[PDB]
Structures are given as structure tokens and as C-alpha cells.
């Protein structure tokens, strides 16, 4: 259905242990496809999915040259960031940047994105209009006016509206078999006693791609939102994901419970129940 391309930058300072480290990873939905680490012997951008390997040499140089330059820039930004917050040159700090475009289920730009963070807290974010900024504090306002004064938002709108979509669509075509294929989850309910009066029903979802999924337990048709322990969706390692939902039911009442699954890989939402095989 819908698709997105996202680049994630992380710059970490480590005083007394060398220069700050810069890593850049690129994604198309939940599939990683590029990586760059300034901490690698001979740092260059590397392929992380089958479909990007066909890209020519000039593509890899264009990429590497950008990320090498970004390594130097984010090193300066980490120093600047100390001034802005009156911080010592002894602490370790992190700057993170998230950016990219969303493609509407047709193929035109649905919305652009570009946020920055300082030590895990929002700093500056490009607004949805791709023309203005939202600075989180007085330090970020310094950055805002520097950006406004240099019309950065302009260059970004052009990337998010042009090149970002062009390439995403290009990657989407080349990686058709996987990028444009949804693998529904395999489902089943397990049962583990926990007392003579209560037992745990656990609904599983495995083998699915993309990561987005919804699991719910209903008792007599009522959602058990506040009673369902849900684990965070995790990666299996084969590109697919796993997730489960559990609820502790009273013994003899397991049939009043249903588990509901919704995934873009399923034509209709699934309902399951415990299947005690006789």
C-alpha cells in the first residue's frame, strides 16, 4: 500500500576516545538498504539489501562523499551544541536526525519529514508545510534563524518533493519482489496454566512483513485493552517480525476469548481462539 524512505543519522561524542562517531542508515519501509560508519577502516556507504547492489559506482561515490562531509559537519554541530547549552567538553553527547518522504498509495508525495534531537530530546523539526520550523527551546531558535536566514527549508522541500520521491519509486521498482510484497503472519493461540483458577492464553503472530500489525483480545466481544500484555514487535532476522498478545483468563472460561489480527497481508481480519485438541 503506502511506502516511505527514511534516513537516520547518529553522531556520538566520546571525549578522550577519539573524534565523534557518525553512522547513517537508510531505509524503505522496514527494510534497511544502506549503512555508513565513520568508525570503519575505509568508511564508505555499503549495501544492505539485494536490490541496491545494482547501483553504479558513481552512486556509491556520491553517497560516500556526502556522508564523509556529514561526519565533519556533525562534529562541528556537537561542539556548537555545547556552547548553546553551556556544557562542558567532558561529557559524551548525541545528535540524531530523522528525515524522508512518505508516498501516498498511488505514488505522489503524501508528506515530507525532517526532525533533529539533542541527547534524545527534540531540538528542531521541519513543519509539514516544508517551509517553516519548530524549535524546542532557546538554543534551537538560534539554529532556526540560522536556517531561515539561509533558506534551508527551500532546499529540503525540493529534495522531499523531487529527488526523494524519484529514488524511492526507483528503489520500489527494483526491489519489487520484497518491497512490494506483504507476508501475512502465521497465527495460533497457546495455553499455559498459572493456577487452578487462571491460565494464560497467548496469541502469536510470526513471519510477517511489514512490521505494522494489530493484535487484540476480546472477552465476550469487549476489548481487553487494559488487561492484555503486548510485547513490542521484534525482528526475526529473516526480514519478518514477531509479536504476541497475552491475557490471564479464569479456568473454564477460555472460550469467551477471541484474538483479533489485522495486517495488510491478510484480506480480512482474523479471529482465533484456543484450540484444545480434545
Amino acid at each position: 500500500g503506502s511506502h516511505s524512505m527514511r534516513y537516520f543519522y547518529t553522531a556520538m561524542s566520546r571525549p578522550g576516545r577519539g573524534e565523534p562517531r557518525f553512522i547513517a542508515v537508510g531505509y524503505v519501509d522496514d527494510t534497511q538498504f544502506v549503512r555508513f560508519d565513520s568508525d570503519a577502516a575505509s568508511p564508505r556507504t555499503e549495501p544492505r539489501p539485494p536490490w541496491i547492489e545494482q547501483e553504479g559506482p558513481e552512486y556509491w561515490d556520491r553517497n560516500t562523499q556526502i556522508f564523509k562531509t556529514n561526519t565533519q559537519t556533525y562534529r562541528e554541530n556537537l561542539r556548537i551544541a555545547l556552547r548553546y547549552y553551556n556544557q562542558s567538553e567532558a561529557g559524551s553527547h548525541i545528535i540524531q536526525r530523522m528525515y524522508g518522504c512518505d508516498l501516498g498509495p498511488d505514488g505522489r508525495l503524501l508528506r515530507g519529514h525532517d526532525q533533529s534531537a539533542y541527547d534524545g530530546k527534540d531540538y528542531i523539526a521541519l513543519n509539514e508545510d516544508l517551509s517553516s520550523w519548530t524549535a524546542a527551546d532557546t538554543a534551537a531558535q538560534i539554529t532556526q534563524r540560522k536556517w531561515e536566514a539561509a533558506r534551508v527549508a527551500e532546499q529540503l522541500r525540493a529534495y522531499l518533493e523531487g529527488l526523494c520521491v524519484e529514488w524511492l519509486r526507483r528503489y520500489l521498482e527494483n526491489g519489487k519482489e520484497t518491497l512490494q510484497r506483504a507476508d501475512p503472519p502465521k497465527t495460533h493461540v497457546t495455553h499455559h496454566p498459572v493456577s487452578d483458577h487462571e491460565a494464560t492464553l497467548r496469541c502469536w503472530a510470526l513471519g510477517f512483513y511489514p512490521a505494522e500489525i494489530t493484535l487484540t483480545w476480546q472477552r465476550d466481544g469487549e476489548d481487553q485493552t487494559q488487561d492484555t500484555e503486548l510485547v513490542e514487535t521484534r525482528p526475526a532476522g529473516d526480514r519478518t517480525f514477531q509479536k504476541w498478545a497475552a491475557v490471564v483468563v479464569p479456568s473454564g472460561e477460555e472460550q469467551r476469548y477471541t484474538c483479533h489480527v489485522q495486517h495488510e497481508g491478510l484480506p480480512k481480519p482474523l479471529t482465533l481462539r484456543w484450540e484444545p485438541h480434545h
Binding site: Y59, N77, Q155, Y159
Partner: peptide
């Protein structure tokens, strides 16, 4: 492919 704008704080 990534962007090429000036990201100086």
C-alpha cells in the same frame, strides 16, 4: 539517495 543540504546548527 540522501540529501545534500547544509546541516550546520
Amino acid at each position: 539517495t540522501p540529501y545534500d543540504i547544509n546541516q550546520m546548527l
